[PDB]
Design an enzyme around this catalytic site. Structure first.
Site, PDB file in Angstrom:
ATOM      1  N   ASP A   1      38.022  46.043  21.903  1.00 12.65           N
ATOM      2  CA  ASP A   1      38.726  45.003  22.652  1.00 12.65           C
ATOM      3  C   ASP A   1      37.802  43.870  23.111  1.00 12.65           C
ATOM      4  O   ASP A   1      37.750  43.503  24.290  1.00 12.65           O
ATOM      5  CB  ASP A   1      39.442  45.622  23.859  1.00 12.65           C
ATOM      6  CG  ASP A   1      40.233  44.592  24.665  1.00 12.65           C
ATOM      7  OD1 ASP A   1      40.741  43.612  24.072  1.00 12.65           O
ATOM      8  OD2 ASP A   1      40.343  44.761  25.898  1.00 12.65           O
TER       9      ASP A   1
ATOM     10  N   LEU B   1      38.523  41.582  42.477  1.00 14.57           N
ATOM     11  CA  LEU B   1      38.345  40.461  41.563  1.00 14.57           C
ATOM     12  C   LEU B   1      39.107  40.664  40.259  1.00 14.57           C
ATOM     13  O   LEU B   1      38.911  39.924  39.292  1.00 14.57           O
ATOM     14  CB  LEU B   1      36.860  40.256  41.259  1.00 14.57           C
ATOM     15  CG  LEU B   1      35.868  40.874  42.239  1.00 14.57           C
ATOM     16  CD1 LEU B   1      35.241  42.091  41.585  1.00 14.57           C
ATOM     17  CD2 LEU B   1      34.804  39.853  42.630  1.00 14.57           C
ATOM     18  N   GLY B   2      39.979  41.665  40.238  1.00 12.67           N
ATOM     19  CA  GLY B   2      40.749  41.934  39.040  1.00 12.67           C
ATOM     20  C   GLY B   2      41.956  42.811  39.288  1.00 12.67           C
ATOM     21  O   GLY B   2      42.146  43.332  40.390  1.00 12.67           O
TER      22      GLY B   2
ATOM     23  N   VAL C   1      39.355  45.919  39.462  1.00 14.73           N
ATOM     24  CA  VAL C   1      37.894  45.889  39.519  1.00 14.73           C
ATOM     25  C   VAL C   1      37.420  45.275  40.831  1.00 14.73           C
ATOM     26  O   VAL C   1      37.530  44.066  41.035  1.00 14.73           O
ATOM     27  CB  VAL C   1      37.291  45.076  38.344  1.00 14.73           C
ATOM     28  CG1 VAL C   1      35.790  45.308  38.273  1.00 14.73           C
ATOM     29  CG2 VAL C   1      37.940  45.491  37.035  1.00 14.73           C
TER      30      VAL C   1
ATOM     31  N   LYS D   1      35.600  50.178  38.751  1.00 11.79           N
ATOM     32  CA  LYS D   1      36.779  49.987  37.948  1.00 11.79           C
ATOM     33  C   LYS D   1      37.719  51.134  38.264  1.00 11.79           C
ATOM     34  O   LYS D   1      37.503  52.266  37.816  1.00 11.79           O
ATOM     35  CB  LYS D   1      36.423  49.985  36.461  1.00 11.79           C
ATOM     36  CG  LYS D   1      36.964  48.785  35.705  1.00 11.79           C
ATOM     37  CD  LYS D   1      37.527  49.180  34.350  1.00 11.79           C
ATOM     38  CE  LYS D   1      38.351  48.055  33.729  1.00 11.79           C
ATOM     39  NZ  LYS D   1      37.742  46.717  33.955  1.00 11.79           N
TER      40      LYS D   1
END
Length: 426
Positions: A300, A191-192, A199, A213
Site C-alpha cells: 500500500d 493526527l489521524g 495515529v 497506531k
C-alpha cells in the site's frame, strides 16, 4: 583502552539505562555486537545501558566530529545542504562505491548553481598513504583535513565548518522492550483516523516521544510484526513496540513533519523545487529498494503512507499489512500483490509528488480507473514535471510486472537524475 565517547547527547528513558552528554567518556567492557551496552560514565560515575550506535572508541577515527563513517553520498548532501552552513562545510566518510576508498564531501555556492556539494575521493593508498591528489599525501585523514582546513589546493573551498548532525535513532526503545504494557503509552495528540484505526502522538515511560497506531476492533498479526521488527533501514520508519491485549497498539518512530501528502498540500509543498521532490522520491525508492532485497512487499505505497522529517527526510511507513488508484491491475484483478505491484504504486506516487499532492486520475472515480487502465490508459505527464520523469512513471505502469523496474534501478536512476552527465567525484 575500553573508553568510548558519546557522539551525541542522550537522555534516559528507564531506570536501567543512563543519560550522557555528547563527548562524555564511557567505560564499556563487553562491546559485543548489540544494540544496548552496559556502560559506566567516567564523568558522572553513572551506570546503565546505552544505545551502542551513540558512541565510538575515543582513540578512533569514528570519534572524529567530522568523520561520518558509512554515511551515504545522498544523506551527506542532505546534511551538507542545510542553508545555515557556510561554503566549505564538510565531512569525511567511506565511499560506498569504490570500496576501501574514502570521501571528502564539501558544500559550496555559486549563483549559476546555488547550493551544491563537491565529493572529493580520498584514496587510502594500500601502503597507508592518503590523498585527494597524488602530488599531496598524508598518513592520516586527520592530517589531510588539517591541511585542507588551511589550504584550498584545488578544492572548491578551504575546509572550514564540520558538518553538523542531529542525534540518530536508537535501535528500539530500550534494552529489551518490544511487547510493552499499554500502561506505558500516553496518547496526547491525534493526527489521524482511518478505517482501520488512528495515529496518536503519545509518550513512552513519560519521557519518550513515540507514535501509537491504534487498530481498534487480530492476533495473527503479531507473528508478522516480528518480521517487521527485523527490517531495519534508514528510509523505513522504525517499529518500536507492539501490544497484544486488544485493541492492539503499534508504537513507532515519530516524524515531526507528518505524512508526505499533507506536507505536499500544506504551506510548504509550494516552495518545494524539483530537485527536492526528486530527492524525496530517491529516499522512498531507497527504503523500498531495501524492502525489495528483503523479499518483502509493502502492499500500500502512496504519499499518504510516507512520513516526513526535518531536512526533507522521507520514510516509508506501514510496510507489510481499497486504494484502487494506486493498485496495479494484476493486484486488483488477481490479488497478486508483489514488489512489482509496489513499483506500479510508486509511479503513481511520483504523480502526487510532482503534482503538489494532487489526486491520481483527477477526473475519474474509483471504478472508472480500474477499467480505464485495463484498456491501456495511463496518466499524462503532469504540468511542468519533466517528460523524463514521466517516462520513468510509464515504466512503472507497464502491463507486465516483469517489465517494470526494480526499486534498486529506480533509486539509482533517481539519485543520479540531475548529475547524470557529471563525474561521481571531482
Amino acid at each position: 583502552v575500553t573508553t568510548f565517547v558519546a557522539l551525541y547527547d542522550y537522555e534516559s528513558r528507564t531506570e536501567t539505562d543512563l543519560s550522557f552528554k555528547k563527548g562524555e567518556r564511557l567505560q564499556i567492557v563487553n562491546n559485543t555486537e548489540g544494540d544496548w551496552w552496559l556502560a559506566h560514565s567516567l564523568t558522572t560515575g553513572q551506570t546503565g545501558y546505552i544505545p551502542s550506535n551513540y558512541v565510538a572508541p575515543s582513540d578512533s577515527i569514528q570519534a572524529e566530529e567530522w568523520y561520518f563513517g558509512k554515511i551515504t553520498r545522498r544523506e551527506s548532501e542532505r546534511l551538507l545542504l542545510n542553508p545555515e552552513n557556510p561554503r566549505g562545510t564538510f565531512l569525511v566518510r567511506e565511499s560506498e562505491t569504490t570500496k576501501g576508498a574514502y570521501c571528502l564531501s564539501v558544500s559550496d555556492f555559486d549563483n549559476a548553481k546555488g547550493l551544491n556539494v563537491k565529493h572529493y575521493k580520498i584514496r587510502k593508498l594500500d601502503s597507508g598513504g592518503f590523498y585527494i591528489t597524488s602530488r599531496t599525501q598524508f598518513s592520516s585523514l586527520q592530517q589531510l583535513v588539517a591541511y585542507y582546513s588551511k589550504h584550498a589546493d584545488g578544492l572548491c573551498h578551504r575546509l572550514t565548518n564540520v558538518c553538523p548532525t542531529s542525534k540518530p535513532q536508537t535501535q528500539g526503545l530500550a534494552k529489551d522492550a518490544w511487547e510493552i504494557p499499554r500502561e506505558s503509552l500516553r496518547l496526547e495528540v491525534k493526527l489521524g483516523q482511518g478505517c482501520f484505526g488512528e495515529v496518536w502522538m503519545g509518550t513512552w515511560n513519560g519521557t519518550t516521544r513515540v507514535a501509537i497506531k491504534t487498530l481498534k476492533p487480530p492476533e495473527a498479526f503479531l507473528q508478522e510484526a516480528q518480521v517487521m521488527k527485523k527490517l531495519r533501514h534508514e528510509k523505513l520508519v522504525q517499529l518500536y513496540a507492539v501490544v497484544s491485549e486488544e485493541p492492539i497498539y503499534i508504537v513507532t518512530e515519530y516524524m515531526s513533519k507528518g505524512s508526505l501528502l499533507d506536507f505536499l498540500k500544506g504551506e510548504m509543498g509550494k516552495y518545494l523545487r524539483l530537485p527536492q521532490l526528486v530527492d524525496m522520491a530517491a529516499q522512498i525508492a531507497s527504503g523500498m529498494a531495501y524492502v525489495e532485497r528483503m523479499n518483502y512487499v509493502h502492499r500500500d505505497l502512496r504519499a499518504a503512507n510516507i512520513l516526513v522529517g526535518e531536512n526533507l527526510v522521507c520514510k516509508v511507513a506501514d510496510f507489510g499489512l481499497f486504494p484502487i488508484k494506486w493498485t496495479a491491475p494484476e493486484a486488483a484483478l488477481y490479488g497478486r500483490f508483489t514488489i512489482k505491484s509496489d513499483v506500479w504504486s510508486f509511479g503513481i506516487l511520483l504523480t502526487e509528488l510532482t503534482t503538489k499532492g494532487r489526486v491520481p486520475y483527477p477526473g475519474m472515480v474509483n471504478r472508472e480507473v480500474l477499467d480505464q487502465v485495463e484498456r491501456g490508459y495511463r496518466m499524462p505527464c503532469p504540468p511542468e514535471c519533466p517528460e523524463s520523469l514521466h517516462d520513468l512513471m510509464c515504466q512503472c505502469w507497464r502491463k507486465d510486472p516483469e517489465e517494470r523496474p526494480t526499486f534498486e534501478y529506480l533509486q539509482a536512476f533517481l539519485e543520479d537524475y540531475f548529475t547524470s552527465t557529471e563525474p561521481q567525484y571531482q
